[PDB]
Symmetry: C3
């Protein structure tokens, strides 16, 4: 049998399976069924359905171990199930696919393909398989795996392309996301983008690049451009000390020696952290440049991969240079705090004795910020290092 309505049914201790729907049935409606099964010999389900396309609402029972068994799944306190195109709380809508819905939406919102949906939106369309549009207006999704959120006049027309808080904007890249933007058209793969009329910033997930059209800023009050150096013998060198090199490693600078910088605690920009992985995890040429292979992913993504170093051991638990003792942030350029002696004057230059500034030939003393005292054995001056 098929095409049957079962509504407003009460079962008082009647049937181990209360309502039962067989295999291959396309169209059944079950509403308002309530059963009692205390006095039944081994009751199973109040409602039972072998396939998933009967429609069900208003189920309650006492004494049945399962209120609903549908397509081999218990819904122990009942189910509300509708099949086909769905629409709730909307004023008007265009096309709705059987696996699409429109909710809380106005003026011709449309979800025309499988797994496409529109929420709380006006005049928005999706023909994207696996997609969501929400909190939006004049918007369209037409690729696949698209989400559009809190957006006006926004288009996502490529796979995994997405827009959040965007106006008059189009995301056309593979895995391409636009945020907090007005009037931008975007195309990169694995890119996060923002802009006003033109693209203004980019987070490139593919190559690991960060781009700003204008400035990048970091740091506080007096800051510097810095680089990680390794200390000779693995010593700790405190901040404010002038360092030199010996056997490729840093130590406190002595008389007549070249000052390469100052141990720094206030870098805005730093190089050579190895924050992600161990430094030798990737193959590098003789100049330190990464060696690559061109890979074309099964899908179609055409990228280049850094070559793995065979000597790399994924067992070894990586501790970054920022946590190691021997590795020091050394300020190379900028306004830097330096340990001085009694001989150092504002507006003058400095040489070094035991890593401590003495009157000399290098750089410029900007201002003494902590005057020398016999008891401390040093003062502190801001030195403009270049």
């Amino acid at each position: 049998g098929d095409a049957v309505n079962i509504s407003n049914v009460t079962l008082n201790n009647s049937g181990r399976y209360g309502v039962s729907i067989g295999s291959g049935i396309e169209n059944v409606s079950i509403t308002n069924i309530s059963g009692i099964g205390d006095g039944i010999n081994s009751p199973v389900a109040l409602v039972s359905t072998i396939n998933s396309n009967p429609e069900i609402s208003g189920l309650s029972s006492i004494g049945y171990p399962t209120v609903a068994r549908v397509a081999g799944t218990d819904y122990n306190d009942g189910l509300t199930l509708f099949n086909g195109a769905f629409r709730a709380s909307t004023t008007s809508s265009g096309k709705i696919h059987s696996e699409g819905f429109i909710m809380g939406s106005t003026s011709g919102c449309e979800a025309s393909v499988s797994k496409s949906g529109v929420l709380t939106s006006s005049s928005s369309k999706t023909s994207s398989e696996r997609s969501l549009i929400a909190g939006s207006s004049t918007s369209e999704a037409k690729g696949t795996y698209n989400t559009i959120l809190g957006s006006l006049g926004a288009v996502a027309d490529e796979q995994f392309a997405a827009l959040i808080s965007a106006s008059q904007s189009r995301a056309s890249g593979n895995h391409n996301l636009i945020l907090s933007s007005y009037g931008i058209n975007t195309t990169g793969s694995y890119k996060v983008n923002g802009g006003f009329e033109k693209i203004n910033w980019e987070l490139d997930s593919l190559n690991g690049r960060i781009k700003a059209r204008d400035t990048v800023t970091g740091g506080n009050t007096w800051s510097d451009f810095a680089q990680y150096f390794e200390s000779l013998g693995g010593q700790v060198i405190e901040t404010g000390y002038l360092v030199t090199l010996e056997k490729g490693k840093i130590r406190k600078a002595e008389k007549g020696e070249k000052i390469i910088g100052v141990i720094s605690e206030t870098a805005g920009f730093v190089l050579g952290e190895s924050s992600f992985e161990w430094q030798g995890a990737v193959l590098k040429n003789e100049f330190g440049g990464i060696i690559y292979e061109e890979v074309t992913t099964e899908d179609g993504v055409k990228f280049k991969r850094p070559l793995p170093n065979p000597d790399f051991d994924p067992n070894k638990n990586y501790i970054p240079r920022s946590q190691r003792r021997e590795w020091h942030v050394v300020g190379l350029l900028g306004q830097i705090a330096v340990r001085i002696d009694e001989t150092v004057k504002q507006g003058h230059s400095i040489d070094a004795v035991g890593g401590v500034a003495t009157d000399g030939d290098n750089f410029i003393v900007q201002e003494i910020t902590t005057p020398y005292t016999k008891e401390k054995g040093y003062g502190v001056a801001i030195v403009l290092v270049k």
Copy 2:
């Protein structure tokens, strides 16, 4: 009384409360009720329900000040209310909690806990309390406060962990977000991450750090690395001027004096903006370190 169906009812000037459901009632169904209340002496509600678990659809009326009062709340133009597990416009589904739903979804989408939901997705599972999965495939959420959007083979298994436009990826950090990524496993707390096979960029909300595996670029045509300096006497020094220092402050450079730089209008990278707060808002040591 309990377990009652009220359907296809028309009230022509009959009852101040049209349909009334008392306290402690678990199971009532109300469909297709239409009332007229012009000629009633002080009508209140077409439908009235003291608790929230009767189910309601197809309500209309004229002359009633409230079409529906449910659990002390007016729904003045009617309500459509279902309770329990919900499913609409989907081909198949696994487990659905009474406070879970599956919509516009295919092949065994499951929402097994309170406040878990799946939209427009295939073979996706959430057991995350307070979560959403949408526009997705082969995906799983299992922490709390997880959203997964436009994603394939994506896992969120920590609190507030989230993924948008991500492939074959896992976010395991506290408040940890992955964007526009393929094949990355992520763990930091208050981190935003992107990558292809390996993590390639990070926005650290916790410590205020920005990290790129490759390059950071800024600026235009001819650019420079720069720093904020304060002018002696508070003068304005125009761009293109060579500056020196005197009493820790900049002025135009003179003969034989040390040139420290040029007033710049085209910096790509700059230090010491104090863009966020006043410079002295935080305690610093003798070397300027926080």
Copy 3:
């Protein structure tokens, strides 16, 4: 009438046209064209707001949004907060 509440608990409210709440507890939207999902103690009150996977989060300006945010407020025009705790934000076209 153009709002909904689904998979939600304790007094979730969607009081305006095109406002909706999903899988959330004690969350309110009075934002026209908005969504709150996977959330708790949260409120949207501007326009074009989405709040996702958030606790004690407020969006009270147009296109302001929060994802994976705690005890946080986005008040800027097209202003987005990510992966954050205890921040109040105000810039226009900013991600914070």
